[PDB]
Amino acid sequence: MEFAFYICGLIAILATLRVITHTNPVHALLYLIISLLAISGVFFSLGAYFAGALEIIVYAGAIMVLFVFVVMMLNLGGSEIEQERQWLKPQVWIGPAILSAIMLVVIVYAILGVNDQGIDGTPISAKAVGITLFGPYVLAVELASMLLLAGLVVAFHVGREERAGEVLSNRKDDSA
Amino acid sequence: MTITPQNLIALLPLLIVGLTVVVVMLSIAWRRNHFLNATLSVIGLNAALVSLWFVGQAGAMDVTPLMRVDGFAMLYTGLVLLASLATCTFAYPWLEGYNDNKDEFYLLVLIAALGGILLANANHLASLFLGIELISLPLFGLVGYAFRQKRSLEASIKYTILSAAASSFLLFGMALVYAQSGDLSFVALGKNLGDGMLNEPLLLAGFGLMIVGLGFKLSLVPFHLWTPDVYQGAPAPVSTFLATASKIAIFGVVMRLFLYAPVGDSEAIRVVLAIIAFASIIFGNLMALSQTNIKRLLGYSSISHLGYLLVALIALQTGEMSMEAVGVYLAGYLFSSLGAFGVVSLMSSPYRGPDADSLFSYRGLFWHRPILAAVMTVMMLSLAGIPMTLGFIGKFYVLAVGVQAHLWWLVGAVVVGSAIGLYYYLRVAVSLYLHAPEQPGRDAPSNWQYSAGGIVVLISALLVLVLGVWPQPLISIVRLAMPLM
Amino acid sequence: STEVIAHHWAFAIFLIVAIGLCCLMLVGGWFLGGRARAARLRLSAKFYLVAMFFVIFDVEALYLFAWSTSIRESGWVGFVEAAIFIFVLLAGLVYLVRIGALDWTP
Amino acid sequence: LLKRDPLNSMMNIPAVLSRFAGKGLLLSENGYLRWYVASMSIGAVVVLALLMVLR
Amino acid sequence: MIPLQHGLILAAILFVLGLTGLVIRRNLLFMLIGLEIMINASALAFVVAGSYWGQTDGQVMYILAISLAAAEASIGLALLLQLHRRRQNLNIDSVSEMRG
Numbered sequence: 048m049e050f051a052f053y054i055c056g057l058i059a060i061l062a063t064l065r066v067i068t069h070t071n072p073v074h075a076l077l078y079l080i081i082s083l084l085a086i087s088g089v090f091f092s093l094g095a096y097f098a099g100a101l102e103i104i105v106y107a108g109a110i111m112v113l114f115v116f117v118v119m120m121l122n123l124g125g126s127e128i129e130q131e132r133q134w135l136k137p138q139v140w141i142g143p144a145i146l147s148a149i150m151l152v153v154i155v156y157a158i159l160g161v162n163d164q165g166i167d168g169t170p171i172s173a174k175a176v177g178i179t180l181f182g183p184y185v186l187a188v189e190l191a192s193m194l195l196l197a198g199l200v201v202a203f204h205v206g207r208e209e210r211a212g213e214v215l216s217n218r219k220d221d222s223a
Numbered sequence: 224m225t226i227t228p229q230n231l232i233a234l235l236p237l238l239i240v241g242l243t244v245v246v247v248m249l250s251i252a253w254r255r256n257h258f259l260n261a262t263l264s265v266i267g268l269n270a271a272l273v274s275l276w277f278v279g280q281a282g283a284m285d286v287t288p289l290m291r292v293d294g295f296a297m298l299y300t301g302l303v304l305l306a307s308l309a310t311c312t313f314a315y316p317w318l319e320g321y322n323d324n325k326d327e328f329y330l331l332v333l334i335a336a337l338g339g340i341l342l343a344n345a346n347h348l349a350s351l352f353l354g355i356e357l358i359s360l361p362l363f364g365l366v367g368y369a370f371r372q373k374r375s376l377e378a379s380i381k382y383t384i385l386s387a388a389a390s391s392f393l394l395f396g397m398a399l400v401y402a403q404s405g406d407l408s409f410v411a412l413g414k415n416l417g418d419g420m421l422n423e424p425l426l427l428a429g430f431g432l433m434i435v436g437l438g439f440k441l442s443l444v445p446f447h448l449w450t451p452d453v454y455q456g457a458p459a460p461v462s463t464f465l466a467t468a469s470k471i472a473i474f475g476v477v478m479r480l481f482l483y484a485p486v487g488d489s490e491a492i493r494v495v496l497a498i499i500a501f502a503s504i505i506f507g508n509l510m511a512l513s514q515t516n517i518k519r520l521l522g523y524s525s526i527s528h529l530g531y532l533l534v535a536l537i538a539l540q541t542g543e544m545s546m547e548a549v550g551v552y553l554a555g556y557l558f559s560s561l562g563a564f565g566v567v568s569l570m571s572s573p574y575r576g577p578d579a580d581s582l583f584s585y586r587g588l589f590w591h592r593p594i595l596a597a598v599m600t601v602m603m604l605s606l607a608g609i610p611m612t613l614g615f616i617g618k619f620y621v622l623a624v625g626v627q628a629h630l631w632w633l634v635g636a637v638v639v640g641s642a643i644g645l646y647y648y649l650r651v652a653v654s655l656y657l658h659a660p661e662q663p664g665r666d667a668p669s670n671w672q673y674s675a676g677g678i679v680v681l682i683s684a685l686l687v688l689v690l691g692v693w694p695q696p697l698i699s700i701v702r703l704a705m706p707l708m
Numbered sequence: 709s710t711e712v713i714a715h716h717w718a719f720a721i722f723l724i725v726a727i728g729l730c731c732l733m734l735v736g737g738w739f740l741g742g743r744a745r746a747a748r749l750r751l752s753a754k755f756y757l758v759a760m761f762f763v764i765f766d767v768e769a770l771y772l773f774a775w776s777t778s779i780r781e782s783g784w785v786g787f788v789e790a791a792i793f794i795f796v797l798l799a800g801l802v803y804l805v806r807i808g809a810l811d812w813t814p
Numbered sequence: 815l816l817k818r819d820p821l822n823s824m825m826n827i828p829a830v831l832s833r834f835a836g837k838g839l840l841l842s843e844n845g846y847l848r849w850y851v852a853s854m855s856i857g858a859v860v861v862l863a864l865l866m867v868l869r
Numbered sequence: 870m871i872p873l874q875h876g877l878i879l880a881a882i883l884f885v886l887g888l889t890g891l892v893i894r895r896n897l898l899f900m901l902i903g904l905e906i907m908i909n910a911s912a913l914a915f916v917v918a919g920s921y922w923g924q925t926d927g928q929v930m931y932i933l934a935i936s937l938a939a940a941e942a943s944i945g946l947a948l949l950l951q952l953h954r955r956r957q958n959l960n961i962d963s964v965s966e967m968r969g
């Protein structure tokens with residue numbers, strides 16, 4: 048459990064850094080999937096068996112698939128932005144990095160001053176979560192369907208193509 | 224708690240709007256019909272407004288651990304339903320010129336309204352988190368409904384990315400609050416802390432990260448840079464909803480949170496909220512002083528009006544008029560905003576591409592659209608807070624709550640901010656009666672649907688004036704709508 | 709119990725041997741055997757929509773999975789709640805099919 | 815000397831400062847979204863820092 | 870046993886890394902990717918907290934969070950498609966016409 052938490056916790060931080068600093072979009076997504084698998088191990092180490100599985104079933108097996116689909120559809124990668132590698136230029140990342148560092152320091156300070164009896168790791172099952180979802184949190188599940196419906200309707204409205212054909216040519220203003 | 228037959232009556236508004244979302248979607252499935260689908264949406268939203276009567280007769284009750292139905296919930300539910308019916312009446316004339324799928328607009332307005340009703344009854348952090356997303360995700364599509372327009376796409380991309388960032392700060396903050404509390408209910412946030420121990424570092428840090436998310440949605444400095452760009456890019460019908468429903472729905476849940484949460488009476492949070500209010504009141508008016516775009520001007524205006532409301536929140540744990548002030552102020556802001564944004568919608572309908580957003584377009588409105596100029600004048604005076612308008616009665620409440628709470632720096636800001644505001648509000652008002660010989664103005668549509676929008680902005684102006692001279696009726700209703708403490 | 713510890717080690721070894729076996733076969737192919745000395749276009753968003761629909765429906769199925777393992781404990785109230793959820797899902801599916809968003813051929 | 819009402823010009827300073835401040839504040843309204851995101855980052859650090867120094 | 874503080878620090882590191890990514894990258898794709906790191910980090914914190922208190926509420930909040938991430942990424946990538954189809958450019962700095 049302890050090894051799993053620290054090893055997976057470290058695999059995640061290292062992979063996440065590779066993602067934000069990578070030039071190749073697909074490689075960045077690969078390191079992002081690696082970090083999601085690492086976070087799934089952290090979830091399992093803490094006893095969150097349901098969250099654990101969902102981390103791989105929905106986040107690294109659906110949301111990420113959609114991202115790869117888009118990168119492969121628009122043939123992303125090798126763009127002037129990813130060729131200039133501006134993010135690597137120190138004058139571009141030093142400022143943002145310092146703001147993030149100060150935010151982390153302040154947050155960590157607050158965390159270090161909290162009561163900590165420790166996380167036992169007793170497994171919380173998906174059955175227990177389901178009893179809660181269809182018991183005290185019933186309105187959440189019903190309204191969550193409406194939220195996903197809104198995503199479906201909006202994504203279709205702005206994501207639908209006006210030009211028919213599996214292969215389309217990139218025209219300015221998508222002129223037909 | 225479980226869902227008893229009695230609990231189900233208190234959910235009528237949420238259940239009716241939800242059923243409307245389904246029936247309208249099944250109607251679009253059967254056959255796209257702009258008139259029928261718009262009509263079905265309006266009928267469902269009205270039915271929900273009428274159901275509020277039955278909810279009131281039933282009485283205050285906590286349906287589940289996530290929702291508490293009381294007078295406050297009914298009042299804010301009514302406000303969101305009114306601002307949403309208006310959005311629909313203003314959309315039909317505009318969507319008539321939209322040569323593309325138009326039934327989905329009403330479908331999204333309904334789901335966003337469901338978010339506001341949830342936020343009105345929200346008594347749990349989960350409800351707060353879900354309600355904001357139910358009122359934000361539909362708006363991403365509404366702000367970018369005319370994706371073919373460059374400004375509408377820019378507005379949608381800006382809102383989506385910034386709202387997503389704001390939702391992560393909110394969730395992370397709620398997680399840190401949970402790590403210290405152990406309960407996600409508002410009444411338990413700060414309850415486990417002992418005497419003089421309320422300022423627990425992590426509890427304060429969680430609230431601080433939650434304020435970044437809530438402050439963004441309420442366009443409060445320093446999370447306000449998005450307001451002018453999104454308000455201008457979003458289609459005019461949508462701008463009306465973003466300026467009214469979202470702000471009123473989210474400001475209300477924040478009031479309930481700082482009222483029920485024991486940590487709400489933290490001086491550190493109060494002093495931080497006070498700096499945000501002062502900046503929002505001064506920065507909003509100062510940035511609107513030189514605006515030549517009415518949409519951007521009304522954006523900066525929202526920054527200041529929300530700053531005025533925050534003063535009542537800062538004086539919440541010191542008086543009882545604080546809740547009454549916000550109710551009266553938000554009622555006035557609703558009618559005043561529906562009036563100004565609605566006139567912009569009618570002058571931008573039918574959709575012909577870019578909206579009439581330049582102040583030059585309104586430089587002789589009276590000599591073409593007399594009643595529309597008169598309404599805009601009344602709303603400009605109301606938003607300025609000029610006695611004889613409901614806007615002033617809202618400002619009076621804020622100043623009274625502030626004085627009773629000795630918020631002298633904030634009361635001084637309201638006076639300086641209002642003085643700065645008079646310059647731009649009056650400029651837009653007097654402009655309507657100037658003579659613009661240049662007439663590139665488009666002819667008004669001639670259908671009862673367009674005339675209905677004109678009635679909405681007219682009735683809203685009449686209410687702003689009648690309640691501006693005789694406010695006791697509204698004061699009595701808002702006083703009945705009190706949270707179940 | 710030694711049983712749970714034994715199963716923990718067995719699962720780890722199975723996973724390590726499985727991935728190790730694949731690497732062995734791949735590295736063997738690379739080593740064993742000799743070797744000769746030696747933008748304008750895009751794919752339709754119809755591919756994205758299918759993936760996006762999959763994501764929405766897959767996340768919706770998560771709730772039904774949690775209900776499935778706890779149907780008896782949730783009782784008839786839970787059934788009524790799930791029924792409403794499944795109806796909304798089917799209603800959206802009907803909408804997608806009727807608007808033609810679910811027909812690959814134009 | 816007083817032909818141009820000097821005291822009125824003195825009472826117009828509150829309005830000259832206002833216009834100037836407005837133009838300076840509008841300089842942060844560059845349409846750049848990355849700046850808007852950085853603005854929220856800066857705001858978060860300031861809010862959290864104040865909450866800890868006022869705790 | 871894992872210290873609750875260690876779990877919360879892991880989430881904070883992944884949150885600040887995701888934010889840094891959203892500000893230093895001009896590509897809309899890398900900005901959307903950065904947001905996914907931020908929302909996943911917030912969901913991880915809820916699971917850590919729920920595990921410390923032994924409550925299913927942490928996993929219930931995680932499910933609501935991943936549902937938003939799925940819906941937000943769906944709409945987010947749809948806007949990216951529209952921008953690419955019309956401007957064949959993902960530099961967010963170019964999407965800055967409205968200002969002042």
Ligand SMILES: CCCCCCCCCCCCCCCCCC(=O)OC[C@H](COP(=O)(O)OCCN)OC(=O)CCCCCCCCCCCCCCCCC
Pocket residue numbers: 272273274275276278279280281282283293294297298299300301302554686697700701703704
């Ligand atoms: C007769 C049947 C057929 C007709 C149906 C009705 C038709 C109209 C429907 C639309 C409007 C509905 C508004 C209903 C308001 C009255 C609700 C009510 O029952 O009021 C009393 C209620 C407390 O009732 P109870 O708990 O039974 O009292 C026990 C006392 N021992 O106390 C409350 O709950 C307080 C209610 C007032 C505050 C909330 C108001 C919400 C609705 C308005 C929102 C907008 C506000 C701004 C309006 C500005 C107008 C200028």
Ligand SMILES: [Cl-]
Pocket residue numbers: 592593594595
């Ligand atoms: Cl008229």
